[PDB]
Amino acid sequence: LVHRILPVAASYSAVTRFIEEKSSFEYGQVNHALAAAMRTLVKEHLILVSQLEQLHRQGLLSLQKLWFYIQPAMRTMDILASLATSVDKGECLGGSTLSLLHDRSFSYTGDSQAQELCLYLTKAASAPY
């Protein structure tokens, strides 16, 4: 069961690495706004697990509850870690990862959970351009 829960951790470590390495000056102004709006979505996850830390000490948390709790965030990070794999492979900056954010906003339209992620990510990252 814990093996089934490990991918969202690798879909955290890749995401938090992206924010550090691709926010240096050399990577460009658009890459700063992308990673800084990816940073907020880290922050919402970090808030959760502290409330979960409180309930676990009270004996109120177990693997069955936790598995349920991380469900909306498992899809969220899966989109973010996939985009981070795309940008680094292609060495993108400027509009080559604003084409990518333009395409991905149409790519998810049937979910409306992932559709609202990318549109927010696109509104944020288009400001330096």
């Binding site: 000056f25 706004a33 400001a127």
Partner: peptide, 17 residues
């Protein structure tokens, strides 16, 4: 003015923070 050049282009950063 070398100190006021030593702050310039640190507000043009794309991260809004």
């Amino acid at each position: 003015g070398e100190l006021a050049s030593a702050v310039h282009a640190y507000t043009k950063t794309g991260d809004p923070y």
